[PDB]
Amino acid sequence: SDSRYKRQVSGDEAYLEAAPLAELHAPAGMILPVTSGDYAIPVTNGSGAVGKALDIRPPAQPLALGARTQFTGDTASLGRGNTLWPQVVSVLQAKNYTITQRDDAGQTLTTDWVQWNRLDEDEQYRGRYQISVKPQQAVTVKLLNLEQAGKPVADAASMQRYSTEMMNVISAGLDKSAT
Amino acid sequence: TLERVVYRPDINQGNYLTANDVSKIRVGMTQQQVAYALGTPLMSDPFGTNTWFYVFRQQPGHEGVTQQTLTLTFNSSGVLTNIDNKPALS
Amino acid sequence: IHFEGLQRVAVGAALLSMPVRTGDTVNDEDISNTIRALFATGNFEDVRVLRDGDTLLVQVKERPTIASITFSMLKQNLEASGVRVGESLDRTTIADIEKGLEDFYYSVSASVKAVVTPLPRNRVDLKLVFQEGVSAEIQQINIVGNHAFTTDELISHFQLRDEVPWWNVVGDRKYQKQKLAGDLETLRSYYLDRGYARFNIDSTQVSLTPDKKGIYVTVNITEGDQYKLSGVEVSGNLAGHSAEIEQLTKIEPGELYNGTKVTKMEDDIKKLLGRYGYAYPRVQSMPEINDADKTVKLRVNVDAGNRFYVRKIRFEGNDTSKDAVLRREMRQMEGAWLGSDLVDQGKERLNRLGFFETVDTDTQRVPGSPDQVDVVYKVKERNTGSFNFGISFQAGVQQDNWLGTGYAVGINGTKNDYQTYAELSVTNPYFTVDGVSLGGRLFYNDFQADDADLSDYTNKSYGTDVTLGFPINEYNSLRAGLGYVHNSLSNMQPQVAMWRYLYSMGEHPSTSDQDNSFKTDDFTFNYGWTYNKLDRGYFPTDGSRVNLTGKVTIPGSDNEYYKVTLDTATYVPIDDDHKWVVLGRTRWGYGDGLGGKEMPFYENFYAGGSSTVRGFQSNTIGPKAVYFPHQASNYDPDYDYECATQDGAKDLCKSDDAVGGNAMAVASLEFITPTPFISDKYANSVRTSFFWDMGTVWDTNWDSSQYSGYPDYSDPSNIRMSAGIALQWMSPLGPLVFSYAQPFKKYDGDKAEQFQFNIGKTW
Amino acid sequence: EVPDNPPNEIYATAQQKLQDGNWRQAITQLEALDNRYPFGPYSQQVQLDLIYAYYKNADLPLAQAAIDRFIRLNPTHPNIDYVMYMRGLTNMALDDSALQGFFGVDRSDRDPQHARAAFSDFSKLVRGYPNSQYTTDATKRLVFLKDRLAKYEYSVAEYYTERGAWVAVVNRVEGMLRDYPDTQATRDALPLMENAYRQMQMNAQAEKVAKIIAANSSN
């Protein structure tokens, strides 16, 4: 049970060893046959992952329970209630998360390094986030940090999943207490 | 050692030209009426030129290969300039 | 260039869907073409194009996105025809969605309606309501209008039966597609079939009951006398040419007109011209009536239309076997002139392989060229193999098509405290090309009795051989090869026939006391002939196959003998080339030693079991060993013996065991019927057959010298019989063969089974 | 049998059983969750989870139909290019049946319809959205697919070379240069067209192909 088979494709990796493509030089006084093609590979330089390194897990646009969230990031998005942003801090302490940087002015705080947990993830993850409210009121959760076994992860695939994981916890606490 | 062997079926390869049908071609064709009664040539010309290769090849019953090759050279306007007919082989 | 307002589809896919070019052109055919393409996208209920500029203006009424289809198996016809959640449904729907649902409710009635209620966001939601009645069945339908034959005699046909009990089944109503049009065509074919030329049906009468409790149909004719045919005249092409077409028209004058013979002539001519490369020979028949005469002169119009070649041959549906497998079995040449019966021989041989069921051929022309044609062979690619694991350890495996290729590979092994046996067979057909096959076989069989060590009877056998076959005829092959077999024997105890062989081989073993030694290595030249013409490689509906295998020793060799065996299988369908089929098979064998004889006792044919005569235990029918007394060298560590001194018996002793003879005959007659009810319609993967089995084995050397008592083992005489039911079911693990039968005979066939399960691969 | 448990919790159970679990047991709850709530809010994510799980479960026909219904239903977007990469990925997984699949056999011939479908899907993915994290990988799969189809044409050309089919050999290799001129099997297939031309007693085209071979070496 290495759990890495859920993050990878099915078939083999043999398609990476395929030799590159080089066109044919035509002799003097003639041409090649032309052309169709109908098979074409426009030039695209990298940069993304290949083979088993590519993460094929379905992307993340939950939760939205008004409910519809805006686009992804680098950002999170959440008709609306009345007032009392501190509900976010009450549900943040309801999960006993560690909180370091605290400001009650702009309705924004910075959440600490408390680690995550997932079943389909190989080693493990963790990260620090930032929560804010910008009024008729929308809660946004961004983050700058990542660690997998202590290694930083800047990739765009995990950023959506682990931003929406914290957004899922916020939506779970506020959804519970608000109803 | 193979002096005499068996077995093998007939292998027919090419366009079927009947003799006298080939006698129906003449200089000044439009390349449209060449295809009228001969056939659409199953071998045409790459590279870069215009010639229609009508090849008649047969290989029945271990006997031997019999192929006559009629190649037609057309100009840029679709009119055949040249006719080259070589029956059998060597 | 400004749009508006477009819910759903945005500017990106909308602008590229029309020839805009964006600054500019003024063409007023391009507003009809751009509006026609925008309407062709299917995203809009209405589209306008106006110019208030300078810049061009657009108008878009977006197509509704249906929120829910409420029918109120009920959504079966809707999710298919059809629209699920999603689209874009528009005005043309309610046209066809009403009539489609009305006509779709008459099978397995109602007058429906359509409810379009627009919701916010994008447009509408649909609700479909139904109505109670009414129904319609087949009240009274008749012609007028015949005078011959009787109206009741005129209507059968494929339908519609109005009406009479009892007791009647199936039913009930019918209309349109294959019912009234097809049966009107059946009446036309009947009336035009026997005499009665120039027969034309005048319109039709379709009327509804005012109560809608019935529906009336009527046909108006207009017979047109008799006109017994005289002569035929063919006018037209081609180089095909004539003598065959002329011989197809040979029907003599004086006979009455028959339409099915005219059409038969038509498709016969079309097949004829199809053999020579003309794949679309437009052909029609125009009879010329004679009123003063009693006769008619048929005018056949024929045009061959440009003999067609083959551009490419593609094989779709093979995800395991290679392309060369199906391509090498073809006689049709890519890049050559097509003909029929060459592509039909491709399907023939493809079925003959049995690697795929089912295979189908399609002849499709090529766009732009009225010459070239592509022929595609689709294959379902059934499973070729069987995995056999018993336990003692027993593992066989058989693969006809290995992975790709078509290398025929098989392995066998068994191991226990007594016997160890391994056999490996590899036959590669199409060695080089043309169907030349080459394969080897390796053989190892070794078993002692008690081991521990070098005490009781021991048997050890090496074996090897190689065979090279090729074809001669299309359906005929024959093989030539050679092999070597080593045999070593210690002890083995005395018995009559085996020691008659030992006596003939020059070695005098001590008569019954205990042990002896024998070592013999023989080289054989093996030949074969295989005739195969079958419907398909397995479950054959029609055909037959005959195999002949033989071997003769070569010098210098210890053992000197020759052996010949032949098998026959025949499948005769009793209806048309399918379904009910009666099969029969035979297995004959014989052999003998050269010089002073005698054929070795590891040769002899056996019988009984699932392979020969079902309901009997394996390898026992005719011959059975007759022992002598003897000593033991082991005796009784809990073991019991047949005949030995102390526990005393000495005269000579019969036995329950089996040796086997040098001559054998077996015949089976099976009645192959379709599997019983609860059938798949895919049931082609399972076969159910009654059968009657028979056979016998005898050793051509017997006695005479034995005046007994003990039976006569040289005789066809009393044979063995069986009758019962057997079925074969193709699994993913392999073909399964089980049988329950037996006997009509035996007549001392000794043991029996009456239930047999074999995988297999068993004939 | 899935229960009536509230629609938000059933997706949670199917979510844990989707992450850790064996798929199809969670696939059942995802399909029932697709039945309930026909339009949103979970329909999109439930449909994507159905896709991913169907593919990883070797349900590939049902996966195929699923992503086809998705890409036809709501191609807004993102996220689509993931779904397109799943189309080409599933069509590629329809090739390589296989236990063959274990040993070193060359799939290059067989039936290359699924490879062509995957080449079309990956093609419309890159040409397309040459941004999303799966592009370059789809590109490498594109060159692999192109070379593979060229390998099929080279196989047919090889057998037909063995048969004496030289007209069909020239038509096949010509079709290779007229489809995949830059692949390996075309350059390796040039001497086959040369040998066919010479065997058919046409030496002009034979010298032409010979000079074409003299232009390059490999590969």
UniProtKB/Swiss-Prot annotation, chain A:
> Is the keyword Lipoprotein assigned to this protein?
yes
Sorted keywords for this record are:
Cell outer membrane, Lipoprotein, Membrane, Palmitate, Signal
- Give the domain of life: Bacteria
> Which GO cellular component terms, listed alphabetically, does the Swiss-Prot or TrEMBL entry include?
Bam protein complex; cell surface; membrane
Q: Where in the cell is it found?
A: Cell outer membrane
* A GO BP annotation: Gram-negative-bacterium-type cell outer membrane assembly
Primary localization class, coarse: membrane
Identify its membrane topology class: Lipid-anchor
As one GO molecular function, the record gives: identical protein binding
What family is reported? Answer: Belongs to the BamC family.
Q: How does it assemble?
A: Part of the Bam complex, which is composed of the outer membrane protein BamA, and four lipoproteins BamB, BamC, BamD and BamE. Forms a subcomplex with BamD and BamE. The Bam complex has the shape of a hat, with the BamA beta-barrel crown in the outer membrane and the periplasmic brim formed by the BamA POTRA domains and the 4 lipoproteins.
Its function, per the record, reads: Part of the outer membrane protein assembly complex (Bam), which is involved in assembly and insertion of beta-barrel proteins into the outer membrane. Nonessential member of the complex that stabilizes the interaction between the essential proteins BamA and BamD. Efficient substrate folding and insertion into the outer membrane requires all 5 subunits.
- Name of this protein: Outer membrane protein assembly factor BamC
Q: Which residues of the full protein are shown?
A: 27 to 214 of 344
Curated annotation (Swiss-Prot), chain B:
Subcellular locations according to the entry: Cell outer membrane
Q: What is this entry's stated membrane topology?
A: Lipid-anchor
GO terms (BP aspect): Gram-negative-bacterium-type cell outer membrane assembly; protein insertion into membrane; response to antibiotic
Q: Which GO molecular-function terms appear in the entry?
A: identical protein binding; protein-macromolecule adaptor activity
Summary of the knockout phenotype: Mutants show minor defects in the assembly of outer membrane proteins.
**Chief localisation class:** membrane
Q: Which UniProt keywords apply?
A: Cell outer membrane, Lipoprotein, Membrane, Palmitate, Signal
The Gene Ontology CC terms held by the record are:
Bam protein complex; membrane
Q: How does it assemble?
A: Part of the Bam complex, which is composed of the outer membrane protein BamA, and four lipoproteins BamB, BamC, BamD and BamE. Forms a subcomplex with BamC and BamD. Monomer in the periplasm, but is able to adopt a dimeric conformation in the cytoplasm. The Bam complex has the shape of a hat, with the BamA beta-barrel crown in the outer membrane and the periplasmic brim formed by the BamA POTRA domains and the 4 lipoproteins. The intact Bam complex can have 2 BamE subunits.
Q: Which family does it belong to?
A: Belongs to the BamE family.
In Swiss-Prot or TrEMBL terms, this protein is called Outer membrane protein assembly factor BamE
Q: Name its species.
A: Escherichia coli (strain K12)
Which gene is this protein's source? bamE
Q: Span of the full-length protein shown?
A: 22 to 111 of 113
UniProtKB/Swiss-Prot annotation, chain C:
Provide the transmembrane region boundaries.
386-391, 392-399, 408-415, 419-428, 437-448, 458-459, 476-488, 517-530, 544-553, 562-572, 582-592, 662-671, 686-698, 721-730, 732-742, 757-761
Q: What does the annotation give as the result of altering G354C?
A: No effect. Lethal
The cellular location(s) given in this protein's UniProt record come to:
Cell outer membrane
Q: Which residues form the POTRA domain?
A: 1-63, 64-133, 136-224, 227-305, 308-382
Annotated phenotype, changing I391C: Reduced folding of OmpT
Impact of altering G390P? Lethal, wild-type protein levels
Q: Which GO terms describe its cellular component?
A: Bam protein complex; cell outer membrane; membrane
Membrane-side (Periplasmic) residue stretches: 1-385, 400-407, 429-436, 460-475, 531-543, 573-581, 672-685, 731
> Residue ranges, Extracellular compartment?
416-418, 449-457, 489-516, 554-561, 593-661, 699-720, 743-756
User: Which PROSITE patterns did the record assign?
Assistant: POTRA
- What's in the keyword line of the UniProt record? Cell adhesion, Cell outer membrane, Membrane, Repeat, Signal, Transmembrane, Transmembrane beta strand
* Record note on what altering E753L does: Very minor growth defect. Lethal
Q: Which GO terms describe its biological process?
A: cell adhesion; Gram-negative-bacterium-type cell outer membrane assembly; protein insertion into membrane
| Known outcome of mutating E334K | Lethal, wild-type protein levels
**In UniProt terms, what is the effect of altering N142A?**
Lethal, protein does not accumulate
Domain remarks in the entry? Contains 5 N-terminal periplasmic polypeptide transport-associated (POTRA) domains which interact with other subunits of the complex, may recruit substrates from the periplasm into the outer membrane and also act as a chaperone. The C-terminal region forms a discontinuous 16-stranded beta-barrel transmembrane region. The central pore is ellipsoid, and probably closed by extracellular loop 6, perhaps with the aid of other loops.
Family assignment from sequence similarity: Belongs to the BamA family.
Q: Which HAMAP family does UniProt cross-reference here?
A: OM_assembly_BamA
UniProtKB/Swiss-Prot annotation, chain D:
Query: Which family does the entry's similarity section mention?
Result: Belongs to the BamD family.
Q: What is its quaternary makeup?
A: Part of the Bam complex, which is composed of the outer membrane protein BamA, and four lipoproteins BamB, BamC, BamD and BamE. Forms a subcomplex with BamC and BamE. Interacts directly with BamA. The Bam complex has the shape of a hat, with the BamA beta-barrel crown in the outer membrane and the periplasmic brim formed by the BamA POTRA domains and the 4 lipoproteins.
Indicate yes or no for the key word Lipoprotein: yes
Main localization is membrane
| Comment, domains | The N-terminal may interact with various proteins as a chaperone to assist in the folding and insertion of proteins into the outer membrane. The C-terminal region may serve as the link between BamA, BamC and BamE.
Task performed by this protein: Part of the outer membrane protein assembly complex (Bam), which is involved in assembly and insertion of beta-barrel proteins into the outer membrane. Constitutes, with BamA, the core component of the assembly machinery. Probably involved in transient protein interactions. Efficient substrate folding and insertion into the outer membrane requires all 5 subunits.
Q: A GO biological process this protein is involved in? A: protein insertion into membrane
Q: What domain of life does the native source organism fall in?
A: Bacteria
One Pfam match: YfiO
> Without the gene, what phenotype results?
Depletion decreases the density of outer membrane proteins, but does not significantly affect transport of lipopolysaccharides to the outer membrane.
- The gene designation is bamD
What GO CC terms are in its UniProt record?
Bam protein complex; cell outer membrane; membrane
Q: How does it sit in the membrane?
A: Lipid-anchor
Keyword Signal included in the entry's annotation: yes
